[PDB]
Design a protein around this ligand. Structure first.
Ligand SMILES: *[C@@H]1O[C@H](CO)[C@@H](O[C@@H]2O[C@H](CO)[C@@H](O[C@@H]3O[C@H](CO)[C@@H](O)[C@H](O)[C@@H]3O)[C@H](O)[C@H]2NC(C)=O)[C@H](O)[C@H]1NC(C)=O
Ligand SMILES: *[C@@H]1O[C@H](CO)[C@@H](O[C@@H]2O[C@H](CO)[C@@H](O)[C@H](O)[C@H]2NC(C)=O)[C@H](O)[C@H]1NC(C)=O
Ligand SMILES: *[C@@H]1O[C@H](CO)[C@@H](O[C@@H]2O[C@H](CO)[C@@H](O)[C@H](O)[C@H]2NC(C)=O)[C@H](O)[C@H]1NC(C)=O
Ligand SMILES: *[C@@H]1O[C@H](CO)[C@@H](O[C@@H]2O[C@H](CO)[C@@H](O)[C@H](O)[C@H]2NC(C)=O)[C@H](O)[C@H]1NC(C)=O
Ligand SMILES: *[C@@H]1O[C@H](CO)[C@@H](O[C@@H]2O[C@H](CO)[C@@H](O)[C@H](O)[C@H]2NC(C)=O)[C@H](O)[C@H]1NC(C)=O
Ligand SMILES: *[C@@H]1O[C@H](CO)[C@@H](O[C@@H]2O[C@H](CO)[C@@H](O)[C@H](O)[C@H]2NC(C)=O)[C@H](O)[C@H]1NC(C)=O
Ligand SMILES: *[C@@H]1O[C@H](CO)[C@@H](O[C@@H]2O[C@H](CO)[C@@H](O)[C@H](O)[C@H]2NC(C)=O)[C@H](O)[C@H]1NC(C)=O
Ligand SMILES: *[C@@H]1O[C@H](CO)[C@@H](O[C@@H]2O[C@H](CO)[C@@H](O)[C@H](O)[C@H]2NC(C)=O)[C@H](O)[C@H]1NC(C)=O
Ligand SMILES: *[C@@H]1O[C@H](CO)[C@@H](O[C@@H]2O[C@H](CO)[C@@H](O)[C@H](O)[C@H]2NC(C)=O)[C@H](O)[C@H]1NC(C)=O
Ligand SMILES: *[C@@H]1O[C@H](CO)[C@@H](O[C@@H]2O[C@H](CO)[C@@H](O)[C@H](O)[C@H]2NC(C)=O)[C@H](O)[C@H]1NC(C)=O
Ligand SMILES: *[C@@H]1O[C@H](CO)[C@@H](O[C@@H]2O[C@H](CO)[C@@H](O)[C@H](O)[C@H]2NC(C)=O)[C@H](O)[C@H]1NC(C)=O
Ligand SMILES: *[C@@H]1O[C@H](CO)[C@@H](O[C@@H]2O[C@H](CO)[C@@H](O)[C@H](O)[C@H]2NC(C)=O)[C@H](O)[C@H]1NC(C)=O
Ligand SMILES: *[C@@H]1O[C@H](CO)[C@@H](O[C@@H]2O[C@H](CO)[C@@H](O)[C@H](O)[C@H]2NC(C)=O)[C@H](O)[C@H]1NC(C)=O
Ligand SMILES: *[C@@H]1O[C@H](CO)[C@@H](O)[C@H](O)[C@H]1NC(C)=O
Ligand SMILES: *[C@@H]1O[C@H](CO)[C@@H](O)[C@H](O)[C@H]1NC(C)=O
Ligand SMILES: *[C@@H]1O[C@H](CO)[C@@H](O)[C@H](O)[C@H]1NC(C)=O
Ligand SMILES: *[C@@H]1O[C@H](CO)[C@@H](O)[C@H](O)[C@H]1NC(C)=O
Ligand SMILES: *[C@@H]1O[C@H](CO)[C@@H](O)[C@H](O)[C@H]1NC(C)=O
Ligand SMILES: *[C@@H]1O[C@H](CO)[C@@H](O)[C@H](O)[C@H]1NC(C)=O
Ligand SMILES: *[C@@H]1O[C@H](CO)[C@@H](O)[C@H](O)[C@H]1NC(C)=O
Ligand SMILES: *[C@@H]1O[C@H](CO)[C@@H](O)[C@H](O)[C@H]1NC(C)=O
Ligand SMILES: *[C@@H]1O[C@H](CO)[C@@H](O)[C@H](O)[C@H]1NC(C)=O
Ligand SMILES: *[C@@H]1O[C@H](CO)[C@@H](O)[C@H](O)[C@H]1NC(C)=O
Ligand SMILES: *[C@@H]1O[C@H](CO)[C@@H](O)[C@H](O)[C@H]1NC(C)=O
Ligand SMILES: *[C@@H]1O[C@H](CO)[C@@H](O)[C@H](O)[C@H]1NC(C)=O
Ligand SMILES: *[C@@H]1O[C@H](CO)[C@@H](O)[C@H](O)[C@H]1NC(C)=O
Ligand SMILES: *[C@@H]1O[C@H](CO)[C@@H](O)[C@H](O)[C@H]1NC(C)=O
Ligand SMILES: *[C@@H]1O[C@H](CO)[C@@H](O)[C@H](O)[C@H]1NC(C)=O
Ligand SMILES: *[C@@H]1O[C@H](CO)[C@@H](O)[C@H](O)[C@H]1NC(C)=O
Ligand SMILES: *[C@@H]1O[C@H](CO)[C@@H](O)[C@H](O)[C@H]1NC(C)=O
Ligand SMILES: *[C@@H]1O[C@H](CO)[C@@H](O)[C@H](O)[C@H]1NC(C)=O
Lengths: 130, 113, 446, 127, 131, 48, 48, 48, 48
């Protein structure tokens, strides 16, 4: 095992795959996520990209996912958003179709996630007071 | 928070009825409000027609009004409309615009009618 | 038999990279160099010596000098941009010789010119006179003209800004570092025994010169001789002195500045009549001190080259006036002094003051560029400046006669060579805080 | 008083001698033409810091300066003893040869951390 | 509960409220925290806000809080800094008065929080190396 | 619909004649006027 | 943040009791005048 | 054949074909460029 | 004022009238002097 070559899936190559298959291609997208008029336009584009990444990192930071890609949450999943079986939503549906299916409930999920994490931190603080 | 309905009191049959509800938001409670339209006839129980959120704008209608009710909103003037196409004689009722939103500051429901 | 990798952050390792340096100064109104837009410098430098590590330092390839020449330019063009353009000045000129208490050494150097120039009103013109020099005035056929009339026009360089070389400090940004070679006898290329990390450099003065290195950094124990290839005819050999020698350059002419209204809000500062006797501007150097400095230079040249050989100095070979004579700035006035009085000596094995004549030009060209110039406006009073010359830019000659009788002459074919004598101790490196190391701890499985 | 070291003071020191002065270097990562030049260099520095923090956050070192991984070190890349490389070797010397093999190391760390996260998710799902 | 909306307190709404009441509205403040002359000025302001946010995140990262808003520390609280009851400060005092009251010691407090975590960090290290 | 959030139980010491908003507004008005006059034609031949 | 004083009789300098934050300022017309304030903002209840 | 609306009369039609056809354009006039000094460093290139 | 004449130096029938030999006074490096120069301009670039 001295001439073994390692190749991985390309950037956005798991778009047409299933949820479980695309669940292992998160690190590649995460690492690949990052005369005066030309300089200011390219500088503004880079600053906008950095600000967008900062906003996404802060969005995951206010929740209980400060750094980890995969993380759970104690709040349950109501069937009002999507009432589908786990055996087929992870093996017979891509990320594009699933994102377009519940695109109207993303704000509600984000709000409930942030309030659940805030009350979770308050409960942890009260528990540590014993 | 105060709401106020507005529209034509007497309308001819078969066209679309348009209503507008004045919504008065709070002082320091920015968020999402759920606006709904509930009508009640004389001597008849009230029935919920449709509802919608103020942030995303998704609407929910009654199972017997897919081809007649149409909900719209505009955060600029803080007013939301109601469009009921093909009005009949059974549509003579009192319309109420309600607002439902949980207040995280005081843990209240604030079901203002 | 088995090991686990360990990730380390903030590891002390660096690599060679390029980046844009910052600025740092502490003064005060207006200047041709770095204005108030530059961030103020720190009250004390953060210099930390590093032991047991040696770094390969080598100039002529680092981009600090290239970044600095470029920034001195862009900023110089931006500073000259808002001044008045002097296109209406290059008109037919009627010049006559001045014979009003003029010394015989300058018979024909100053010309009293007269010309028809426009005024504030576009429908009127006025006949006005001014004094010009023979170096920036060329004939046409008595009817003369400027030397830059057939070339592109240029501004006047407004008196509100000053040409004083205010020192600036280049600071590395976040994630980068500047390594300084603390070796007292570094020859310019090789490993440096003592390296010290610093955030900003010293007080580098952005002075302009071609032959004599004005206000350069001094050595520690003896003079230094640096060159890319000492055995090559090209690649100018620059020497840095260990002690500074003073030079007194002055203009005894009492020039008078007069204002001429070119048009609406456009003013031209012309040279008026000369008050008193007219004498040639010159520089004075201590002959004994200069001879001692030349003795130290030839001693180091003999120890660098073959031993027990005879060497000599000669003046400039030729070319334009920028490299033929010593060109520099003194109180806003540009001087071109004859250097033949210094580089004229012979030194063999086992072995009160000198006055250098000087001329003054108004329409100049600081660099090799031909599309731009500058009309230096005359200032009133007698200009006198005492400075220190701490280096030379000497070049050899072809036809080596069995390594005997080697001659050296002043050069100055490049502008960045002046800044290379001040930016030789520093280098820019990029810090890579990520590191790996095969330990045995392993990750504690959740 | 208390004196530990300065910035980059352990460059010539060994691995173990430089293993405890990494935190100061950790915080050390953070006319109009000069203003835009300073702004461009500042943006580049911010981008480099965010890229390094992102690469650390991908692995199991989101908020830790010292961290180990469950991947077996491949002896073909080093072929030396632990005490010899940790007591008679500097960071620069190791950096001279680990530069060609750092891409495969980073890739294996990323896939291994993703596999560990998947295993943790399955463990939480199965309780 | 399916036909109700979500409403929270606005930006800086609990500035004059108590500490216990203002501790639950930090999310909105944290979320709100993030011709060429006009462009240079706008980009400079945006970038300046970026280093301020990264400086705050870096100051929190050196402690035992990798991104969480509310977090506890192991260092003891010196009673000489305030000499006041916890009940009256959390129930009868705003964040502004508390900030101007101990505005001096905060800096040196940050320093202990930092070095302490540093030695605390190597604590798990010389234990995690025992595996 | 700009957000207006009332801040009760707090008093801020307002002080004019030192606020930088008016200075920035003056600088912005001067800059906007100078940039607005840039594409217009100069009137140099009128001085006759 | 931008703080606005909602006091009807707000003085030149002092502690405003009714403070309210806002995302952006109200409609301000940058008129040009030297002696009489033309099209300016009116007061609340009396001349100040 | 590419178009936003093929049935639209005012919409343009873009046709692309695989085998290109070669066109040979020539200007047999052997004119001489002349430089005219029209000011300081300004050269107007005219047809001689 | 460009005084133009037609070019009949072996001109063909189709190219006849397309070119015009125009003479005019142009400024030089010296502002107080002018020069009488001649050039060739196409009919599409000149109007009567
Ligand atoms: C501005 O200050 C006033 C005066 O304190 C606040 O009004 C009242 O404040 C109390 C304490 O913060 C609120 O809690 C109540 O406390 C009493 C004990 O005093 C308790 O018996 C109640 O069950 C309740 O927990 C109270 O809700 C509040 N409002 C009332 C009485 O109408 C006011 O809230 C402060 N403003 C802000 C924005 O915080
Ligand atoms: C695209 O879809 C095909 C069809 O599912 C994938 O190919 C494999 O097809 C077999 C058919 O029995 C499945 O059992 C496999 O699970 C499929 N592979 C995977 C990895 O799921 C194909 O892989 C898909 N490709 C992409 C890029 O999505
Ligand atoms: C400035 O212009 C005047 C004319 O206004 C020149 O004076 C003479 O003018 C006559 C015409 O009236 C010409 O024929 C002469 O050739 C002009 N020159 C002389 C010397 O008589 C005057 O010479 C102009 N000055 C300069 C420096 O060109
Ligand atoms: C500057 O000093 C360095 C270090 O000695 C010189 O580099 C090498 O020096 C050794 C001396 O033992 C020579 O054998 C090598 O040939 C040198 N290298 C090269 C590429 O020439 C360097 O030559 C010195 N430079 C000057 C101008 O003296
Ligand atoms: C320094 O310059 C001398 C110039 O003579 C170089 O010597 C010659 O180099 C060429 C290669 O470019 C050889 O082909 C010749 O044989 C060399 N000797 C002669 C002409 O006598 C020398 O190589 C240069 N040194 C460096 C380090 O650049
Ligand atoms: C240079 O020449 C001018 C023009 O002759 C001199 O200026 C004065 O010009 C007026 C013109 O009417 C004469 O009447 C004066 O006699 C001139 N002054 C003098 C002192 O003669 C100017 O002085 C001359 N400058 C020099 C240094 O010779
Ligand atoms: C350059 O000028 C300086 C200042 O005038 C000279 O320094 C003085 O020289 C005199 C000579 O008589 C001494 O008496 C003074 O003590 C010196 N110093 C001062 C502060 O006045 C210097 O000698 C001049 N150099 C040359 C080469 O002319
Ligand atoms: C030129 O060199 C002299 C001699 O070094 C400078 O005068 C001071 O001399 C003393 C003793 O030699 C030094 O300790 C000082 O550091 C020198 N002053 C400075 C500012 O370095 C003199 O300042 C130099 N410059 C000029 C313009 O004369
Ligand atoms: C440079 O190297 C020397 C020796 O390699 C270092 O000296 C060691 O210092 C430590 C304590 O600092 C002692 O425990 C060792 O016994 C010393 N080594 C020897 C051989 O005596 C020195 O610390 C190093 N300096 C730097 C800055 O890294
Ligand atoms: C890392 O890569 C470089 C270049 O790919 C390797 O450099 C080689 O070094 C040897 C001996 O110094 C030369 O013979 C080769 O020609 C170099 N390679 C190339 C492409 O020029 C270096 O050895 C590599 N590091 C390791 C540890 O293998
Ligand atoms: C911080 O410490 C100072 C004492 O060093 C306290 O007193 C202030 O001292 C400065 C000058 O040293 C004066 O300008 C202030 O007026 C003083 N403040 C008061 C309230 O008198 C200061 O109070 C301390 N600040 C705290 C504890 O928040
Ligand atoms: C493409 O252009 C045609 C133009 O013929 C459009 O056809 C129109 O279709 C509507 C259907 O209600 C008719 O009322 C119009 O009279 C038609 N136009 C004409 C000129 O007859 C067709 O809609 C266009 N397609 C688009 C815009 O997608
Ligand atoms: C170029 O300038 C000359 C000189 O002014 C013009 O010639 C004049 O033309 C007018 C109109 O026909 C006559 O009234 C003058 O007598 C002429 N003067 C001279 C000195 O010849 C000429 O017309 C201008 N234009 C061209 C195209 O040559
Ligand atoms: C060493 O590296 C190769 C890849 O080049 C890999 O396939 C092999 O498994 C590694 N050996 C060990 C023991 O991990
Ligand atoms: C979902 O699972 C249930 C059993 O739990 C099954 O009866 C149903 O058919 C499944 N539906 C789909 C769409 O797979
Ligand atoms: C002016 O002096 C120069 C140099 O002596 C001479 O060549 C020239 O002929 C003189 N001109 C006049 C008009 O005297
Ligand atoms: C401009 O005139 C000078 C006069 O000496 C001459 O040397 C130079 O070649 C001229 N340049 C051009 C472009 O004609
Ligand atoms: C130069 O001339 C002016 C004119 O008044 C005079 O005041 C000044 O003293 C003169 N300078 C010298 C050095 O003679
Ligand atoms: C230079 O020396 C000469 C004598 O050789 C003297 O006349 C002159 O005044 C001196 N100038 C200066 C500035 O010392
Ligand atoms: C320069 O000094 C040397 C001795 O160092 C001496 O032989 C020589 O004559 C001196 N030259 C002059 C011009 O003083
Ligand atoms: C050159 O010769 C002299 C003779 O005195 C001697 O002192 C010196 O060390 C020699 N230098 C070299 C480099 O051989
Ligand atoms: C150099 O000096 C010689 C000796 O007098 C002289 O003939 C020659 O013209 C000088 N050259 C320059 C460029 O000064
Ligand atoms: C410098 O002076 C010498 C003195 O003889 C002279 O020969 C030489 O031509 C002068 N150089 C210049 C450029 O005038
Ligand atoms: C060069 O020095 C010699 C030595 O006496 C002298 O005769 C000659 O005139 C000098 N030449 C110049 C141009 O200074
Ligand atoms: C490791 O240490 C042993 C004992 O000192 C030695 O024999 C062996 O050669 C060392 N390994 C390497 C790679 O040098
Ligand atoms: C979904 O159901 C959960 C409990 O099953 C409940 O807490 C939550 O409020 C529901 N959400 C909606 C939008 O109905
Ligand atoms: C608390 O502060 C006092 C001074 O205010 C200091 O002497 C003491 O050491 C500090 N720590 C403790 C634990 O009391
Ligand atoms: C603090 O609270 C305790 C009981 O909670 C009380 O006994 C004590 O008097 C209080 N101190 C002050 C200063 O109010
Ligand atoms: C084009 O075709 C004509 C046909 O007579 C020929 O005269 C002419 O030379 C051709 N030109 C080129 C450029 O092929
Ligand atoms: C155009 O004229 C030039 C003038 O020298 C000549 O060299 C060239 O061959 C001519 N070209 C043709 C195609 O006639
Ligand atoms: C010159 O050419 C024009 C067309 O550009 C034509 O109208 C006119 O008649 C021609 N004149 C002569 C004399 O050929």
């Amino acid at each position: 095992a001295v001439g073994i070559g390692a190749v991985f899936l390309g950037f956005l190559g798991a778009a047409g795959s299933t949820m479980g298959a695309a669940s292992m291609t998160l690190t590649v997208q995460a690492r690949n996520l990052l005369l005066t008029v030309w300089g200011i336009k390219q500088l503004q584009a880079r600053v906008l990209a950095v600000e967008r990444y900062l906003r996404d990192q802060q969005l995951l930071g206010i929740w209980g996912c400060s750094g980890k890609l995969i993380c759970c949450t104690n709040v349950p999943w109501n069937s009002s958003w999507s009432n589908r079986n786990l055996s087929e939503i992870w093996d017979n549906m891509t990320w594009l179709q699933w994102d377009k299916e519940i695109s109207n409930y993303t704000q509600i999920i984000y709000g409930l996630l942030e309030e659940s994490q805030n009350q979770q931190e308050k409960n942890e603080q009260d528990l540590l007071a014993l | 928070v105060q709401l106020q309905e507005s529209g034509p009191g007497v309308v001819k049959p078969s066209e679309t009825l348009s209503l507008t509800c004045e919504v008065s938001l709070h002082a320091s409670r920015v968020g999402s409000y759920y606006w709904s339209w509930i009508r009640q006839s004389q001597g008849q129980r009230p029935e919920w027609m449709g509802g919608l959120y103020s942030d995303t704008g998704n609407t929910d209608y009654n199972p017997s009004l897919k081809s007649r009710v149409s909900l719209s909103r505009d955060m600029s003037k803080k007013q939301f409309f109601l469009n009921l196409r093909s009005v009949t004689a059974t549509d003579t009722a009192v319309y109420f615009c309600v607002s439902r939103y949980v207040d995280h500051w005081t843990n209240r429901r604030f079901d203002v009618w | 038999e088995n090991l686990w990798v360990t990730v380390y952050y903030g590891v002390p390792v660096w690599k060679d990279a390029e980046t844009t340096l910052f600025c740092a100064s502490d003064a005060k109104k207006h200047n041709v160099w770095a204005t108030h837009a530059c961030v103020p410098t720190d009250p004390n430098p953060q210099e930390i010596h590093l032991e047991n590590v040696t770094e390969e330092f080598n100039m002529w390839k680092n981009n600090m000098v290239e970044q600095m020449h470029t920034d001195i330019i862009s900023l110089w063009d931006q500073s000259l941009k808002p001044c008045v353009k002097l296109t209406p000045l290059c008109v037919t000129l009627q010049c006559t010789n001045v014979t009003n208490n003029i010394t015989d050494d300058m018979r024909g150097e100053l010309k009293n010119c007269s010309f028809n120039m426009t005024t504030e009103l576009r429908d009127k013109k006025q006949k006005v006179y001014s004094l010009f020099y023979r170096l920036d005035v060329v004939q046409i056929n008595k009817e003369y003209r400027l030397i830059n009339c057939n070339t592109s026009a240029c501004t006047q360089a407004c008196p509100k800004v000053s040409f004083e070389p205010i020192p600036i400090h280049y600071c590395a940004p976040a994630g980068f570092a500047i390594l300084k070679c603390k070796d007292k006898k570094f020859n310019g290329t090789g490993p440096c025994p003592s390296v010290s990390t610093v955030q900003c450099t010293h007080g580098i003065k952005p002075v302009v010169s071609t032959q004599l290195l004005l206000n350069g950094s001094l050595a520690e124990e003896e003079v230094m001789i640096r060159s890319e290839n000492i055995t090559n005819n090209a690649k100018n050999i620059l020497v840095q002195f260990n002690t500074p020698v003073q030079i007194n350059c002055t203009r005894p002419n009492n020039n008078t500045r007069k204002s001429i209204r070119i048009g609406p809000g456009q003013a031209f500062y012309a040279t008026g009549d000369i008050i008193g006797d007219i004498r040639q501007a010159h520089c004075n150097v201590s002959k004994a001190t200069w001879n001692e400095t030349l003795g130290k230079v030839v001693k180091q040249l003999r120890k660098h080259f073959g031993n027990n050989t005879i060497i000599r100095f000669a003046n400039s070979s030729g070319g334009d006036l920028e490299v033929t004579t010593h060109s520099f700035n003194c109180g806003g006035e540009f001087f071109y002094c004859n250097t033949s009085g210094l580089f004229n000596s012979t030194w063999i094995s086992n072995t009160d003051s000198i006055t250098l004549p000087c001329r003054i030009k108004q329409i100049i060209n600081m660099w090799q560029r031909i599309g731009q110039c500058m009309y230096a406006p005359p200032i009133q009073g007698v200009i006198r400046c005492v400075s220190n010359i701490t280096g030379l830019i000497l070049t050899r000659d072809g036809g080596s006669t069995n390594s005997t009788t080697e001659t050296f002459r002043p050069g100055g074919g490049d502008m960045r060579d002046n800044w290379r004598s001040e930016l030789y101790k520093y280098k820019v490196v990029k810090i890579e805080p990520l590191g790996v190391a095969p330990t045995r701890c392993k990750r504690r499985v959740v």
